Design a protein around this ligand. Structure first.
Ligand code: ZN
Ligand code: ZN
Length: 202
């Protein structure tokens, strides 16, 4: 019923995801290289209805403004990182040309329906305070939380190691053991495959 596609883009190889149903598409983490994203959006030939952000670090939002300027769609994210968009010290870009001037819509933990797309939102902070995981019937998009044999870094702004470990162990590890998990970087993994992840402790 849904098809998930991806491009790996930008300075730090961010996974941008395209979620299609029979009649529309939503985009998650438009990281950069917006002409490549737009090219695939034009290939899909279904109207883009929304952008979802797992979080608002610079490498997940670099193409947000270009896509909104072209298609005029809402951008959804957790309110705890609204101030990340315009603030390069908070989103990490301060460290050559990244900000977003969009006014975002807030999303909270719970069941959601956006333009015919039904999914569950989990608030999974620790790598960032507004990190969200988006759970669909046949896959989940987890952001910079649980990687294949790795974990999101917890030394960024408002990051915290024990918070992320709890988010992974108490929320992401409640999903179906073989559900494909698609993180912000690197290949997919699953809850079963990450049971002995060595970065989780406590
Ligand atoms: Zn990040
Ligand atoms: Zn990232």
């Amino acid at each position: 019923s849904m098809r998930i596609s991806s491009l790996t883009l930008g300075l730090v190889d961010t996974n941008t995801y395209f979620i299609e149903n029979d009649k529309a598409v939503i985009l998650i983490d438009p990281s950069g290289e917006s002409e490549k994203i737009i090219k695939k959006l034009n290939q899909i030939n279904k109207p883009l209805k929304a952008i979802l952000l797992t979080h608002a670090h610079f490498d997940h939002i670099g193409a947000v403004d270009d896509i909104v300027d072209r298609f005029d769609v809402p951008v959804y994210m957790h309110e705890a990182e609204f101030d990340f968009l315009k603030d390069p010290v908070k989103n990490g870009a301060d460290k050559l040309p990244i900000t977003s001037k969009v006014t975002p819509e807030k999303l909270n933990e719970g069941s959601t329906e956006i333009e015919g797309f039904k999914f569950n939102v989990l608030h999974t902070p620790g790598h960032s305070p507004g990190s969200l995981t988006y759970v669909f019937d046949e896959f989940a998009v987890v952001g910079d939380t649980l990687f294949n044999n790795g974990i999101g870094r917890t030394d960024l702004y408002k990051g915290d190691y024990e918070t992320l470990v709890d988010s992974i162990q108490d929320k992401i590890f409640e999903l179906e053991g073989d559900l494909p998990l698609f993180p912000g970087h690197g290949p997919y993994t699953t809850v079963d495959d990450e049971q002995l992840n060595p970065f989780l402790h406590g």
